[PDB]
Amino acid sequence: GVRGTCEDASLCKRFAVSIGYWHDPYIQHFVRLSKERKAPEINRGYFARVHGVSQLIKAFLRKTECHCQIVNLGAGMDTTFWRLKDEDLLSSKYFEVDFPMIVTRKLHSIKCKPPLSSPILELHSEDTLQMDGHILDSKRYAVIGADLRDLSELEEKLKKCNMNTQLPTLLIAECVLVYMTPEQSANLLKWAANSFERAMFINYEQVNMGDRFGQIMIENLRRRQCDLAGVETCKSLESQKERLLSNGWETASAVDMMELYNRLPRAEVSRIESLEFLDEMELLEQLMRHYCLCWATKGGNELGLKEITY
Numbered sequence: 001g002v003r004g005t006c007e008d009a010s011l012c013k014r015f016a017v018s019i020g021y022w023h024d025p026y027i028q029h030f031v032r033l034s035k036e037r038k039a040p041e042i043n044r045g046y047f048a049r050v051h052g053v054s055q056l057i058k059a060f061l062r063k064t065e066c067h068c069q070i071v072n073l074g075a076g077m078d079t080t081f082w083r084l085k086d087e088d089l090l091s092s093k094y095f096e097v098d099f100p101m102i103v104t105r106k107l108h109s110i111k112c113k114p115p116l117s118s119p120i121l122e123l124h125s126e127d128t129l130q131m132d133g134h135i136l137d138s139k140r141y142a143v144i145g146a147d148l149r150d151l152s153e154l155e156e157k158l159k160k161c162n163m164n165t166q167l168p169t170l171l172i173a174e175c176v177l178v179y180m181t182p183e184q185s186a187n188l189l190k191w192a193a194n195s196f197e198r199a200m201f202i203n204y205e206q207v208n209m210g211d212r213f214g215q216i217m218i219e220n221l222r223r224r225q226c227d228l229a230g231v232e233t234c235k236s237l238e239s240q241k242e243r244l245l246s247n248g249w250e251t252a253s254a255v256d257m258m259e260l261y262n263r264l265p266r267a268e269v270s271r272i273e274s275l276e277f278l279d280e281m282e283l284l285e286q287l288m289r290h291y292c293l294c295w296a297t298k299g300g301n302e303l304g305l306k307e308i309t310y
């Protein structure tokens with residue numbers, strides 16, 4: 001069930017892109033275009049998610065002048081590496097982690113499609129990519145098959161791909177931590193904090209899950225054999241912040257997605273709202289109030305990391 005979320009996320013993102021929510025010429029190479037009608041509330045939610053996460057990544061890249069690493073944990077078919085390259089934003093090295101099966105799928109897409117492999121090769125120090133098995137390693141981009149609940153495997157394979165614990169490092173978990181136990185996600189967060197002197201962590205996932213709407217969401221996901229093993233932490237923005245502060249992080253900010261959406265520039269909101277008609281604002285408000293964007297920093301005072309916002 002948990003691996004299946006990668007496909008769902010990719011399917012939803014490509015669909016939103018096809019309607020014009022944001023620009024992504026790469027996602028087509030990793031997933032088919034869904035053909036059925038969706039709630040516009042869902043597309044707006046995906047846009048807010050992607051925008052918020054992107055804003056935070058770009059703020060980190062500005063503060064570090066791109067002299068840094070990005071590690072995307074549970075990255076699925078994310079295209080952020082290619083989209084950043086196009087914007088002339090390239091970290092020193094960009095790392096992705098997912099289950100071996102998911103990584104195999106992603107490497108197959110890259111190997112089959114020159115629009116994906118070429119940009120990687122352009123920046124590499126060799127005239128070829130070694131992509132056998134569950135690892136792609138290159139100068140500026142690595143994709144690693146590892147179970148995030150096995151921290152020894154995670155660290156070993158990241159270090160095999162020359163992850164440098166001395167660079168300011170941004171770690172991202174976009175709709176990932178909720179699938180592991182509270183102990184497993186806490187251990188991951190603590191591992192990250194212990195590993196890096198100067199760091200930032202972005203967590204996007206559910207929030208306010210104790211109410212009826214949240215209980216219904218949980219059961220709809222348990223109905224598809226996909227348990228929200230970490231949903232306890234999604235009680236509130238407070239429980240989200242506490243998990244960060246109690247596992248080695250120095251700062252913790254969190255916002256629900258409705259507030260984020262309400263704080264978007266007027267131009268972005270007008271553009272977004274132009275794409276599809278939405279009849280009842282309350283379904284939207286409800287959905288947006290049950291997701292959150294959280295970020296934590298440590299050792300960032302010289303870089304001004306605690307000043308980063310969405």
Ligand SMILES: Nc1ncnc2c1ncn2[C@@H]1O[C@H](CSCC[C@H](N)C(=O)O)[C@@H](O)[C@H]1O
Binds near residue numbers: 099
């Ligand atoms: N224990 C674990 N180890 C490695 N990957 C995991 C994991 N638990 C969940 N994942 C991955 O987390 C992803 C959740 S779907 C979200 C994908 C991507 N971050 C996006 O936002 O578009 C899936 O690809 C799933 O395989």
